[PDB]
Amino acid sequence: LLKKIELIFVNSLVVIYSELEKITLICDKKKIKNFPLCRALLRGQFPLLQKLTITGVTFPMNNQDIMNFQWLLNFPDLKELWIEDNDNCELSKFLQLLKFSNVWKNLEKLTFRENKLYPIVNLDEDQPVTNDDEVPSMLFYKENLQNLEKLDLMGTSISGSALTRLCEQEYLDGRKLRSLNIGNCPNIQFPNNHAHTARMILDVNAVLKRLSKLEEINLSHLSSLNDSTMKSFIINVPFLENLKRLDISHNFEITGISIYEFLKKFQMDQPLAYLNIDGCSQVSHITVNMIRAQNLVTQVDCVYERDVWRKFGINSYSYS
Amino acid sequence: ALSPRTLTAQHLNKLVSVEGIVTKTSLVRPKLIRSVHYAAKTGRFHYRDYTDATTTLTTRIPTPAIYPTEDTEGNKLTTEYGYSTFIDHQRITVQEMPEMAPAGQLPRSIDVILDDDLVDKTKPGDRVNVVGVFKSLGAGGMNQSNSNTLIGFKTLILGNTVYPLHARAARQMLTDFDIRNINKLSKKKDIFDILSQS
Numbered sequence: 408l409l410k411k412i413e414l415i416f417v418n419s420l421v422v423i424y425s426e427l428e429k430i431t432l433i434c435d436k437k438k439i440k441n442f443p444l445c446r447a448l449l450r451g452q453f454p455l456l457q458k459l460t461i462t463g464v465t466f467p468m469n470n471q472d473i474m475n476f477q478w479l480l481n482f483p484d485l486k487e488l489w490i491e492d493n494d495n496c497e498l499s500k501f502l503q504l505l506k507f508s509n510v511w512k513n514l515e516k517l518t519f520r521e522n523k524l525y526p527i528v529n530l531d532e533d534q535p536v537t538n539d540d541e542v543p544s545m546l547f548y549k550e551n552l553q554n555l556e557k558l559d560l561m562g563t564s565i566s567g568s569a570l571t572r573l574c575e576q577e578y579l580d581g582r583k584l585r586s587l588n589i590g591n592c593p594n595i596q597f598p599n600n601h602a603h604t605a606r607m608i609l610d611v612n613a614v615l616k617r618l619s620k621l622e623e624i625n626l627s628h629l630s631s632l633n634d635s636t637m638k639s640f641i642i643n644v645p646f647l648e649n650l651k652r653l654d655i656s657h658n659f660e661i662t663g664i665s666i667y668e669f670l671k672k673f674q675m676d677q678p679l680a681y682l683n684i685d686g687c688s689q690v691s692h693i694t695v696n697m698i699r700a701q702n703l704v705t706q707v708d709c710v711y712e713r714d715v716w717r718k719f720g721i722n723s724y725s726y727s
Numbered sequence: 728a729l730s731p732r733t734l735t736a737q738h739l740n741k742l743v744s745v746e747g748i749v750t751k752t753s754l755v756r757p758k759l760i761r762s763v764h765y766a767a768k769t770g771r772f773h774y775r776d777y778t779d780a781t782t783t784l785t786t787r788i789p790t791p792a793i794y795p796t797e798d799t800e801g802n803k804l805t806t807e808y809g810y811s812t813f814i815d816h817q818r819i820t821v822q823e824m825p826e827m828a829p830a831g832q833l834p835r836s837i838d839v840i841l842d843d844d845l846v847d848k849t850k851p852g853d854r855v856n857v858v859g860v861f862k863s864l865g866a867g868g869m870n871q872s873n874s875n876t877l878i879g880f881k882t883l884i885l886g887n888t889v890y891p892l893h894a895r896a897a898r899q900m901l902t903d904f905d906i907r908n909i910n911k912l913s914k915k916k917d918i919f920d921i922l923s924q925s
Contacts, residue, residue, distance in 0.1 A: 522800065524770035593771060659776070688788075715799070 410455075415726065416443060416463075422451045430456060434463035435726045436492060442466055442473065449478035458487040462724045466495040476504045485511055489559075491520035492725035498563045499528045506531060509547045517552075518559035518588075520725075527594055529606060530569040532576070548578040555584055561625070562591040567609030570595075574617035581618035588625035590654070590716075595629060597636035611639050615646035625654040627683070627716055632658055637665035644672045651680040656708070657716050658687050663694030670703040682707040686714065731823040731835040734861060743861045745884060747821035749853045750836065755846055757813035758782070762794055764804040773804060780864035781816075781840050781885060815846040821857060821884075841886045848889035855891055859884040 413431040419438040430453070432444055442464040449472065459482060466473050474495065490496065498519055504510060536543045558579065560570075570589065573579045589595060596603045597611060624647075626632055632655060640647075655661060666684065673679055682704045684690045688711070695709045717723035729738065730746045760782060764773045777790040796804050819841065823834035839857050841848070849855050866873075867880035912918060 523768065 414443065417726070424451055424453045425455055427453050428455050429458040429460075431458075431460040431724070432462070432464065433460070433724055433726050436463040436465075436494065439463060440465050442493075445470075445473060445478075448481070449473065452481045454483065456482045456485060458489075459485060460487075460489040460724055461493060462489075462491040463726055464493050466493060468495065475500050479504060480508060480510050483511060485514060487516040487518075488514060489516075489518040489724060491518065491723060492522045494522055496521055497525050497528075498560070498565060499525060502528065502531060505548055505551050506546055507544065509550050511551050511554075513554045514551070515554060516557040516559075517555055518557070519563055520559070520561050520723075521563050524593060525564050527566050527607070528564055528569060529566050530572040530576075532572060548573075549576065552578045553580050553583070555579060557586045557588075558584060559588040559625075560592065561588050561627075564594055565589070565592055566594040566607050567596055568606040571608075571610045571613050574614045577617070579618060582620060584618050585621050585649075586623035586625075587618070587621055588627075588654075590625050590627035590629055592629065593631070596631055597639050599635045599638055600631070600633075612643055612646070615643050619646050620649045621647070622649055623652040624650060627654045627656045627658070629655070629658060630660055633660045634662050634665045637661065637669060641665075641669055641672050644669075644675070648676050653679065653681065654683040656683040656685040656687060658684075660689065661687055662689040663691040666690060666698065667694055667703075670698060674703055678702055679704045681705065684708065685710045686716070687711070730827055731821055731837045732827065734835075734837060738861050739863055739882070741861060742858070742887075743884065744856060744858045745821055745837065745839075746827075746856050747823055747836075747854075748825075749819050749849045749851055749855050750822050751818075751820040752847075752849070752851055753818040755815050755817050758816040758842070759792070759811070760814055761812040763807040763810040763812075764795065765807055766798050766802050766804055768802045769798055769800065772807070772810075773798065780862075781883070782814075782842075784860055784862075784885065814843050817841045817846045819849065821855065824854070837882065837884060839884045839886045839889075841889065845886050845889050849891055853891050855889060857884060857886055857890070858888045859886040 409426055411429040411431075412427065414433070416432075416434045416439050418435065419440070430444075434443070445464075445467065468474070472478070474497070498521055501519060530548075532546070534543045534546055552573070574581065594607045595609045596607045598608060600608075661684075666682075670679060670682075684695070685708050687709075690709060690711075695707060698704055698707055717725060719725075719727060728744045728746070734743060734745060760777050762775050762777070764775075766773055773795070775790070775795055777792070778787045779789050780786070794806050798804060817840075819839050820836050821839055822836040825834050828834045839859060862883050862885055863880045864883060865881045868876045868878045915921075
């Protein structure tokens with residue numbers, strides 16, 4: 408009869424499952440040096456499964472099918488996927504699965520978060536042909552990703568161009584998508600920067616023109632969002648007028664200058680609903696108090712002393 | 728336009744020009760301003776910027792000289808010299824010109840702070856005009872260790888330029904006019920008189 412299961416493996420010591428609707432597997436990365444449900448997940452099928460949430464497990468090197476997310480094909484109708492801090496996973500392999508199968512008829516939400524900086528991943532738009540006298544392989548990126556309301560890619564080493572290609576190809580619908588998190592991604596640079604390889608540029612103008620009606624943005628920990636780069640957001644305010652909730656916290660570069668000119672330009676749209684700038688060292692006290700006094704943000708958070716972002720259960724399911 | 732005498736507490740945080748003479752040039756030291764660290768397992772290059780009362784024209788919380796050695800995830804960090812940024816740093820004590828010091832008074836003096844390309848613009852004894860921002864720094868005995876609070880705050884000039892006043896050719900250029908007249912003169916007999924009597 409079990410529909411929702413939550414295994415929280417705090418510690419270590421030494422077939423069809425139609426009932427199951429939600430699976431949560433949270434594992435202490437220090438202790439759980441394996442992947443507990445791996446054999447079950449790769450062998451069994453869980454057809455009713457609406458949500459999956461796997462964190463902290465270590466993908467075994469010995470089985471490339473696990474590393475290639477081959478098991479993940481077993482779960483159609485998977486409305487939400489959250490997958491975080493599983494040390495030996497990669498977005499690189501994940502996007503191969505998204506390339507070569509119509510693995511899902513509908514994802515409402517995706518949240519992929521690898522921990523370490525894997526090599527630069529780029530959207531693999533290479534469409535090979537078996538022969539010139541034959542059809543190419545259909546690249547299933549669109550029909551897999553079309554449905555997403557929430558895309559979270561925090562820390563995932565995705566290049567800025569890869570994200571622009573998701574928008575230019577319209578693999579991400581742009582109207583269905585309503586919230587976006589790309590915080591902590593080092594391979595995101597903005598057009599105002601001068602020191603990069605071009606494929607790390609995120610053309611925010613192209614992207615914001617694509618997915619304009621999104622409500623929530625998270626660029627937290629994105630050191631690359633310097634004050635100069637924030638000028639791109641200023642000139643792109645007309646393409647993000649649906650935005651209510653903004654997180655750019657734990658950025659040790661973004662001065663209060665960019666906050667003020669962004670909010671003054673946003674106010675030309677009626678304040679912003681919510682802004683998070685906890686942990687930011689350069690958001691001057693008088694500036695944020697002027698933001699409150701002028702009521703440019705309905706709520707703005709400025710806990711300078713808050714060292715961390717991963718509120719457990721709320722912002723992250725990586726354990727403790 | 729001032730000198731270390733008429734530089735006064737009314738001038739604090741204003742941009743000032745001081746006419747004076749250099750004394751007590753410190754040794755040049757490298758001052759850390761950005762440290763770069765490869766994370767052993769994480770792969771990322773973490774970094775930290777640093778602040779003190781001299782590196783910035785405005786007050787910001789001081790960052791106390793420590794290299795971080797652990798990631799948020801606990802992974803150990805290896806500091807990257809070369810990619811890390813250090814600026815040259817030097818202190819020079821500009822003394823008042825003794826000609827200006829009035830009857831019965833010693834000459835006042837102040838410490839200029841110089842960074843990177845202004846370092847070693849001058850040596851001791853150079854008559855100089857410095858332009859920079861006049862500043863206070865430190866706790867001035869307001870911190871609760873100091874029972875004596877009659878001591879004044881430390882003050883400085885953070886230098887923006889250093890003009891040596893050499894005027895109020897070690898090897899000369901030579902024009903064809905010089906080449907001609909040198910050789911034409913050398914054929915005359917009385918050069919040993921005329922040049923020496925010049």
